[PDB]
Amino acid sequence: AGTVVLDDVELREAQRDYLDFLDDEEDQGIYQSKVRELISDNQYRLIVNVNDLRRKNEKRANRLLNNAFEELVAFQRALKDFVASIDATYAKQYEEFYVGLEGSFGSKHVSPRTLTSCFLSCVVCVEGIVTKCSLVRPKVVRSVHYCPATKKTIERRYSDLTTLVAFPSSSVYPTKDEENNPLETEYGLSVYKDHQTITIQEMPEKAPAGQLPRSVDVILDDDLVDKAKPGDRVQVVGTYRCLPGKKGGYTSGTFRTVLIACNVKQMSIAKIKKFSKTRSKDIFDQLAKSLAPSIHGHDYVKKAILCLLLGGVERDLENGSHIRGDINILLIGDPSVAKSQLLRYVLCTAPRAIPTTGRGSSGVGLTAAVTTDQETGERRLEAGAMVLADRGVVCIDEFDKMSDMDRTAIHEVMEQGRVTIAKAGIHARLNARCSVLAAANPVYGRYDQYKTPMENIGLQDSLLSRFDLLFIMLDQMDPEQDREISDHVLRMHRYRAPGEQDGDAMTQIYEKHDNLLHGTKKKKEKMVSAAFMKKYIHVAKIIKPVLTQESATYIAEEYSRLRSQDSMSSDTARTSPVTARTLETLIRLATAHAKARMSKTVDLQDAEEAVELVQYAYFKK
Amino acid sequence: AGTVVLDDVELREAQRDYLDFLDDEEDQGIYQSKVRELISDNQYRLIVNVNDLRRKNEKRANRLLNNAFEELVAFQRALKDFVASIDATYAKQYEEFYVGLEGSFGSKHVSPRTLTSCFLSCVVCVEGIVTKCSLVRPKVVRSVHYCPATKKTIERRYSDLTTLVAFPSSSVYPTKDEENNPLETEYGLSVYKDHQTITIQEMPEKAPAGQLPRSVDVILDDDLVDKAKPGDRVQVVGTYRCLPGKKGGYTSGTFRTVLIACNVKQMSIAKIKKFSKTRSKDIFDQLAKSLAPSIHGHDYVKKAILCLLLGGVERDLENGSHIRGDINILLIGDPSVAKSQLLRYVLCTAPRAIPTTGRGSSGVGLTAAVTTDQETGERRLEAGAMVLADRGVVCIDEFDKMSDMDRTAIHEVMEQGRVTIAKAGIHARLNARCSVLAAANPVYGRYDQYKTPMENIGLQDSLLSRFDLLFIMLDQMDPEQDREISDHVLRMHRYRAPGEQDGDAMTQIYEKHDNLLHGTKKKKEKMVSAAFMKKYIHVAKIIKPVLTQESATYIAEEYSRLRSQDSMSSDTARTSPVTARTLETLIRLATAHAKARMSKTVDLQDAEEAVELVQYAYFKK
Amino acid sequence: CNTDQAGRPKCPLDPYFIMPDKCKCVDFQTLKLQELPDAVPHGEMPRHM
Amino acid sequence: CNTDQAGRPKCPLDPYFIMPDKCKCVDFQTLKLQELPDAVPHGEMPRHM
DNA sequence: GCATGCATGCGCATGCATGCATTATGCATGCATGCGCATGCATGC
DNA sequence: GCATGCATGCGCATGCATGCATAATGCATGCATGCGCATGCATGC
Numbered sequence A, B: 001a002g003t004v005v006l007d008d009v010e011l012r013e014a015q016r017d018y019l020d021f022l023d024d025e026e027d028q029g030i031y032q033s034k035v036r037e038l039i040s041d042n043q044y045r046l047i048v049n050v051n052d053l054r055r056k057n058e059k060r061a062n063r064l065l066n067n068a069f070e071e072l073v074a075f076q077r078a079l080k081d082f083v084a085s086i087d088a089t090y091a092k093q094y095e096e097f098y099v100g101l102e103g104s105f106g107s108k109h110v111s112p113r114t115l116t117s118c119f120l121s122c123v124v125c126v127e128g129i130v131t132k133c134s135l136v137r138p139k140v141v142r143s144v145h146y147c148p149a150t151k152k153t154i155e156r157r158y159s160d161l162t163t164l165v166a167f168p169s170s171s172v173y174p175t176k177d178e179e180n181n182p183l184e185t186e187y188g189l190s191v192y193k194d195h196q197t198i199t200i201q202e203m204p205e206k207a208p209a210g211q212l213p214r215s216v217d218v219i220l221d222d223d224l225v226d227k228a229k230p231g232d233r234v235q236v237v238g239t240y241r242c243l244p245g246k247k248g249g250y251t252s253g254t255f256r257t258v259l260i261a262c263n264v265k266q267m268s269i270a271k272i273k274k275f276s277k278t279r280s281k282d283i284f285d286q287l288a289k290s291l292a293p294s295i296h297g298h299d300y301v302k303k304a305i306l307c308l309l310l311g312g313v314e315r316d317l318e319n320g321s322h323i324r325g326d327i328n329i330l331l332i333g334d335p336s337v338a339k340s341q342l343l344r345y346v347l348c349t350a351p352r353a354i355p356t357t358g359r360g361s362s363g364v365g366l367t368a369a370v371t372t373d374q375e376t377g378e379r380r381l382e383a384g385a386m387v388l389a390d391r392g393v394v395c396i397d398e399f400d401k402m403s404d405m406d407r408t409a410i411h412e413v414m415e416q417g418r419v420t421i422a423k424a425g426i427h428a429r430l431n432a433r434c435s436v437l438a439a440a441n442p443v444y445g446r447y448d449q450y451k452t453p454m455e456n457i458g459l460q461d462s463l464l465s466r467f468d469l470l471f472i473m474l475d476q477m478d479p480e481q482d483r484e485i486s487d488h489v490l491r492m493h494r495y496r497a498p499g500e501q502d503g504d505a506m507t508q509i510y511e512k513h514d515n516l517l518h519g520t521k522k523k524k525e526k527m528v529s530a531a532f533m534k535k536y537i538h539v540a541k542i543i544k545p546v547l548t549q550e551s552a553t554y555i556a557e558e559y560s561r562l563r564s565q566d567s568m569s570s571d572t573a574r575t576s577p578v579t580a581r582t583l584e585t586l587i588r589l590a591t592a593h594a595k596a597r598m599s600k601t602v603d604l605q606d607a608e609e610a611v612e613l614v615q616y617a618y619f620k621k
Numbered sequence C, D: 001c002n003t004d005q006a007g008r009p010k011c012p013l014d015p016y017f018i019m020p021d022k023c024k025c026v027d028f029q030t031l032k033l034q035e036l037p038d039a040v041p042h043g044e045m046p047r048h049m
Numbered sequence E: 001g002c003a004t005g006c007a008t009g010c011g012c013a014t015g016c017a018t019g020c021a022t023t024a025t026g027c028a029t030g031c032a033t034g035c036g037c038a039t040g041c042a043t044g045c
Numbered sequence F: 001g002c003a004t005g006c007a008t009g010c011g012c013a014t015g016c017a018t019g020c021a022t023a024a025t026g027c028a029t030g031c032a033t034g035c036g037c038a039t040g041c042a043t044g045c
């Protein structure tokens, strides 16, 4: 086609507007460093805040939201121009670059249930869960052929979705020469791009109760191929378009609507160094004390939860042997001792946390399963709760109600951290390294003091050895303790959020002091802010300490001392048996304490703290 | 169409070969100056000798003659490259340049009768006469449109004969926008090229006697539009191709063959300055003496013919008055005095010479005619012999046999030099400035001496006054004159061309002396070569002399003397009457003599020579 | 193809394609309705629409 | 159009055009012949071929 | 000079190669889901 | 531990929207040329 366009006021003006938008010379803009980062990382697309564009140029934002394709084309042209300007050499590699979108879209923030034809041809944002995914497939863009008879090579260009409507003249694969000499395809010189299709469903938590769900279909291009997986909660921003049906005579008048993604999102130094170096022991002291103001007392359980948050060190050797580094805890107590509050707080704070109660999930939904795909006849693996929580936390409330077979299944995860799966036609070893919290009621409803803990717990020695720590909590009815508990509870109850009028319906390292949440006496001390706590926890989890020679003999001698004291402990009973796992638990707790205070080696104080914890947990009066 | 070609050995090698062909750096080539001349003259095509190409590269010449289109494309690409190289600015004006061909094609030199399918797709050369021509018509190449509704302008490109076969998708004129908004054509911004069609017939002189003629059809492109006219003898070099018929289901299998022209040809200082400045009078002396060695004696007739060759000066004034500058001669003599030999020699030597005998051409075929074109119903003008011979020579043998009406028609050409034509619907004044030679036999077969020349000539005084000069030639049977004539005739008869073996079947200013053609006695003098004679005649015809005050009174007094001597001439009769035309004849002959010797002004000697000629011609014993 | 083309060659048979990006679209739904249980005749299967 | 095209859309009706530059050509002539005057029957018009 | 001959010239009919105009219906395939069957897992007593 | 219940699971039929395959003949127009006519030019006597 020889038709060309000479002038177009709108397109030229829009391109000029984007050129001025992405200059960042007389402004505090950052996009220049973003482009330099893209050049450094060999990536070929940019993400631009919609709110930023609206602030700088409201008319362009309005036009882009109301009309997508032409404005996106102008964006891509402007990106090509500026990439050529900054570094023309890098722009040679890729044909055209792409634009992502970000920011608060406002009215266009639309649920899969509320997508309508009113938003067609516009850019929309949607939040959902992923249910179906397809295999990655290549697609031809540029084809190259060679003719052995005449020693000539030719090239053909393809453009199918670049243009809105395609015709039979295009998309034809050449096979013969002008004189019927055969052509040989040369796959090395051709160009291909990847293609994938996914399906998104409205989350069951958001859908109205008792109603069937509604879903949308998404196409993922070459860059965003591997960014999504089934069973995942995502947010997708992209165009909403109609699908051209293939040629025919009579049409019913109903198109197919498909969302074409442009952005896919998985929804989620000096201060730290100074604080750590100055505090050392006070680091873990305050972190244990400031774990959760909403919960009263129970310092040992807070210490244990902090040890889970920091964790041990995974180790590997020459022979391929694996040594576990995770910690596991079981709490048993009387009703209303706030075990479930602790579980919920750990769910909120931990990065990868999944709650799975006793009978809520069975043995199949915990680890994994194998299903025969009807579409192809092959065998596929579906991951369970524990496989999804790799290097994460699984919380199990009402642990006693869980059946025996489920606990035998959990043995594989608790011992080695791997899951072996096999059915005729497929077999695999999946990684499931994880940590477990569990809370179980006593068998008699309330913990009996006179009976030994073995009768009350009612669990076999193997399962007890599987757990690193056992804790027993009691509701002692001391008048002064009850007074303290009532004071704390009513102080929390009377508190109201600042900035909210009374009677209405419904970052510094240390938190600001509060008259009610802290109290007048506590003015001499402060609590650590949640955000800094999370940052410090992440940094500590990164750090890799090493064990010293001073503490190894000390810990070994104390383990031997405990195994000999087994005969000496005559006035009290033992909660858990002492096996070879106890020594690994000692080393693990020592390393966790060494993680608490940023350093390079494990010292004696960490071993002493670990041993104090072990002595407290393993024996009771 | 997205199909492209990456490699082609033959085309690239041919382009490289032409690049090396047109370099002219380490060679004595001239094409660089040719390109510079083309840039100077704003022309956009080149002519290249085929024999030169064959000498430099025989394989390329063979391929070009055997295969035309691809090789011509390579030539045009190479021209574009070198025009860009020498001056890239000039190459911007024109899309692509073109190549002409020249030289001896040899076997491919083909008559319109001998063109066959064996020469299809090759470059051929043909010699013929032009019979039909068509009006010049523009053709669209690039179209430009504007939309007042959306203020957008678009452009479409057309390429019909650039590609061998065209399809209905192309050659479509756009009239509506994508949203049916009307478009307004803007003829200023579009691009057009001229187009013409002509027909060529084999010349009747070359065709076998008694057989019907055969013709070829030629298409003339934008550059060669005005290079041909009907009734013209031309040589055309170009491709010979088939013509694609328009779409249909059933075909008889017979194509139309059309020749596409690439070249159209109309078939045809120090020495001069030194010779003229040194010789002066001897210039015309030798030119008269060396006019034609094949003819014996008759110095006066040779002088008169030389005066025709040089001619007078055309003059114009303020009031639009026109003054004739041509000369006219009539010879009357006994049989075998070589009048027709003189006419044939003047035909051979003069640039534009046309022979038209007495009854060979009538009054209509002499001047012009008007014909009603059946194709359109309009009136068209067809030029006769005298209109074609503008600023030329018409030779009329057997002038006495011409009818009276034809001579009355010739009056208009002889007096003013123009032809007035009129028929209801059209009227014109055509230019016919010309000079006439005429030879007429005496009425009595042989010239009678005793009777006055008026009885012998038998022509009215008006026609005699129309002619500038009258000459009478006689065959006097003097024994010594007969001996001289026999010597000359037999010397010419015994002569043989040098380089030709005896008995076989069938540039220096001065000609080399010959033993027989000149003789032993004539060694003291030499004759002027024909080529230098033609060059000098052309240069003299260019020169524009001016009349001096010295000779005007002298000539006027001699004219009065002649008109008074009219009573004094009692012993002899007068051949021609003395009218006002005699004075103009005197001035004309004076200016012709002044042309003979290159100078700036007319002198007295030229007037004396003119008067001697007049005295000799106007009276006889 | 309803275009006046003289001298030009003509379009083939069935040359039309639907352009999806230049159409007006509206929402569409289908529902299934059942006869009221209060008015269904005794011993008769309910009817649908 | 005799090409196997699955998934691709198909060519229209009557899609073929004659390529003139890729054909072999030979010379062609027609003549008119008349019966010999030596053998034409008396009083009969001559025949042609 | 007047009487005659006549090569040129013009308008409307038919014959013949190319060229132009026309144009819905019937049959096949993959997605959704019912119905019978055997294995296997989980739950009581 | 053995007897029973049962939520999961698999393979082949039909129903229904989209999608796929087929496929020369008759009529119109411009170029070439015959046949009747009147004007006009040229040529004798």
Ligand SMILES: Nc1ncnc2c1ncn2[C@@H]1O[C@H](COP(=O)(O)OP(=O)(O)O)[C@@H](O)[C@H]1O
Pocket (backbone or CB within 6 Å): A294, A295, A296, A297, A334, A335, A336, A337, A338, A339, A340, A341, A488, A489
């Ligand atoms: N130490 C404590 N500090 C503050 N509140 C507590 C404490 N112990 C119990 N509570 C209160 O008692 C309630 C116990 O509920 P829950 O955590 O479900 O108990 P359990 O998990 O033992 O069944 C909570 O709402 C909590 O507010």
Ligand SMILES: Nc1ncnc2c1ncn2[C@@H]1O[C@H](COP(=O)(O)OP(=O)(O)O)[C@@H](O)[C@H]1O
Pocket (backbone or CB within 6 Å): B294, B295, B296, B297, B334, B335, B336, B337, B338, B339, B340, B341, B488, B489
């Ligand atoms: N002066 C001359 N010089 C040479 N040859 C002459 C001369 N006069 C006559 N002839 C010869 O006589 C012949 C005359 O023939 P031509 O020119 O036809 O005579 P005309 O033209 O008088 O009928 C010519 O062939 C020529 O060779």
Ligand SMILES: [Mg+2]
Pocket (backbone or CB within 6 Å): A339, A340
């Ligand atoms: Mg609870």
Ligand SMILES: [Mg+2]
Pocket (backbone or CB within 6 Å): B339, B340
């Ligand atoms: Mg003669």
